[PDB]
Amino acid sequence: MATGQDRVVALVDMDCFFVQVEQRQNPHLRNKPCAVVQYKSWKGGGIIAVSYEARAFGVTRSMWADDAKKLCPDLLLAQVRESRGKANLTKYREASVEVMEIMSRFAVIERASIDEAYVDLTSAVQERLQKLQGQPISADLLPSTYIEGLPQGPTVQKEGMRKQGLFQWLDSLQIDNLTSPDLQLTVGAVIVEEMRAAIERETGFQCSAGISHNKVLAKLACGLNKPNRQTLVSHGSVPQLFSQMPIRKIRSLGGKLGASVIEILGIEYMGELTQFTESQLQSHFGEKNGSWLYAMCRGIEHDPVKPRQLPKTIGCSKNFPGKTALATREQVQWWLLQLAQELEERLTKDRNDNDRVATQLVVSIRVQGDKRLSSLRRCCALTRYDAHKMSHDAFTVIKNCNTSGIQTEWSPPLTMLFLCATKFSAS
DNA sequence: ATGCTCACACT
DNA sequence: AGTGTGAG
Numbered sequence: 255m256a257t258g259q260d261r262v263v264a265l266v267d268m269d270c271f272f273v274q275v276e277q278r279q280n281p282h283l284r285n286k287p288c289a290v291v292q293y294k295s296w297k298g299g300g301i302i303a304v305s306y307e308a309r310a311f312g313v314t315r316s317m318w319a320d321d322a323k324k325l326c327p328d329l330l331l332a333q334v335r336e337s338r339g340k341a342n343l344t345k346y347r348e349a350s351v352e353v354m355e356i357m358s359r360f361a362v363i364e365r366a367s368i369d370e371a372y373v374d375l376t377s378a379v380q381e382r383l384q385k386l387q388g389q390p391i392s393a394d395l396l397p398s399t400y401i402e403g404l405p406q407g408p409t410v411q412k413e414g415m416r417k418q419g420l421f422q423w424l425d426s427l428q429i430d431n432l433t434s435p436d437l438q439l440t441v442g443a444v445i446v447e448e449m450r451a452a453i454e455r456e457t458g459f460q461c462s463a464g465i466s467h468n469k470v471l472a473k474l475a476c477g478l479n480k481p482n483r484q485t486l487v488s489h490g491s492v493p494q495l496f497s498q499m500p501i502r503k504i505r506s507l508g509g510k511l512g513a514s515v516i517e518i519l520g521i522e523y524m525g526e527l528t529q530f531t532e533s534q535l536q537s538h539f540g541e542k543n544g545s546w547l548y549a550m551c552r553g554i555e556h557d558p559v560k561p562r563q564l565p566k567t568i569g570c571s572k573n574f575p576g577k578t579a580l581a582t583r584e585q586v587q588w589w590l591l592q593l594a595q596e597l598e599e600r601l602t603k604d605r606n607d608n609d610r611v612a613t614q615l616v617v618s619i620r621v622q623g624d625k626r627l628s629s630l631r632r633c634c635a636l637t638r639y640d641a642h643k644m645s646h647d648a649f650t651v652i653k654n655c656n657t658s659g660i661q662t663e664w665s666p667p668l669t670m671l672f673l674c675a676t677k678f679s680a681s
Numbered sequence: 682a683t684g685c686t687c688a689c690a691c692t
Numbered sequence: 693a694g695t696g697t698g699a700g
């Protein structure tokens with residue numbers, strides 16, 4: 255029986271990333287309830303990142319700033335930069351590259367979002383397991399690590415609980431067995447503290463981390479003790495951990511699939527899936543899903559950490575909800591060129607920095623009356639980094655979508671535009 | 682009437 | 693090639 259303990263995998267995720275990025279630049283926002291918002295003039299703007307002090311009052315993402323101000327009257331706000339009539343995230347991307355580069359010096363990372371990367375420490379761990387002989391791992395190596403499920407058996411504040419668990423774990427450590435998966439997790443964890451201190455020391459950003467044996471468990475583990483702590487989730491913590499873990503909380507189970515898992519099987523918690531045979535799960539959700547479900551509810555997941563620090567695509571979009579929809583064609587030309595211009599500015603940076611060029615341009619739109627995030631995706635060739643050509647070509651491949659027989663108008667009105675550069679190739 | 686993204690599977 | 697799902 256292969257037991258999902260071959261790998262040592264960490265997920266590092268920045269604590270309230272956009273807020274921290276603003277708080278480093280505006281020190282008065284530090285250690286105070288703040289949020290970041292986009293576009294201030296509708297309802298104060300929508301909230302895309304919330305500090306932990308603001309979360310104490312009930313402030314969340316997707317809220318409008320004016321509503322958040324009602325929960326938390328003393329709340330401070332930073333507005334994302336605006337350029338060419340639209341949001342501009344350059345600041346946060348550039349902060350992310352800071353974090354990704356540091357992480358890159360320790361091991362091969364898979365960038366999973368603007369603020370998180372997976373790292374595979376299998377190799378680094380065994381190299382460390384030679385470097386310090388066969389000597390103990392002191393608690394002072396894990397000053398911010400929690401051991402999930404510990405303490406157990408026979409102090410009422412959180413750091414007390416942390417210590418007792420870490421003491422229990424370390425006391426139980428089979429130092430003599432460079433084979434044992436729990437020892438490897440521990441050594442992985444020692445590396446992640448170093449990795450995390452390097453991030454805060456070199457960027458001023460704080461973050462959390464999950465250390466386990468696969469991408470999914472490390473993701474779950476990272477969120478258990480946010481902010482500014484890291485959590486080790488061992489194979490043996492899984493049964494109790496999943497026994498009350500709602501299905502929706504596992505990566506990729508938070509949408510329709512997890513909902514059908516709950517409806518069809520009539521269960522609630524991750525651990526309840528172990529009841530079912532693999533074929534049974536493959537009966538209800540297909541070969542790959544039933545397989546993945548069957549092994550995931552036992553802590554086993556085989557998705558690898560992909561060596562990928564650079565995005566596979568560079569994209570640019572703006573929504574036009576309500577009466578703001580675009581319904582003249584000269585209006586569609588202008589915003590197309592607004593988007594093409596930022597894309598060109600970002601593509602030029604990418605080729606200079608990363609020795610690659612995008613070869614295919616994707617143009618996507620939504621139209622008032624449709625329901626789905628995109629209403630239509632079309633493609634063309636990306637041959638010159640010129641905003642005027644990309645926008646012109648973006649128009650050409652969608653101009654037939656105009657139902658309206660009038661020359662000047664555009665109906666149905668367009669509720670979104672999306673340009674994405676892709677199919678990168680070494681240059 | 683939240684925004685703006687990014688990866689991936691299916692077909 | 694184009695759609696849909698899941699995510700931060």
Ligand SMILES: Nc1ccn([C@H]2C[C@H](O)[C@@H](COP(=O)(O)NP(=O)(O)OP(=O)(O)O)O2)c(=O)n1
Binds near residue numbers: 271700
């Ligand atoms: N729906 C979302 C989710 C995140 N983001 C951006 C801003 C977030 O700060 C940044 C990182 O997202 P996140 O890790 O999911 N949450 P954040 O880092 O803000 O706080 P934590 O909850 O991770 O501490 O992505 C976004 O713009 N739209």
Ligand SMILES: [Mn+2]
Binds near residue numbers: 267268269270271
């Ligand atoms: Mn984060």
Ligand SMILES: [Mn+2]
Binds near residue numbers: 267268367370700
């Ligand atoms: Mn994140």
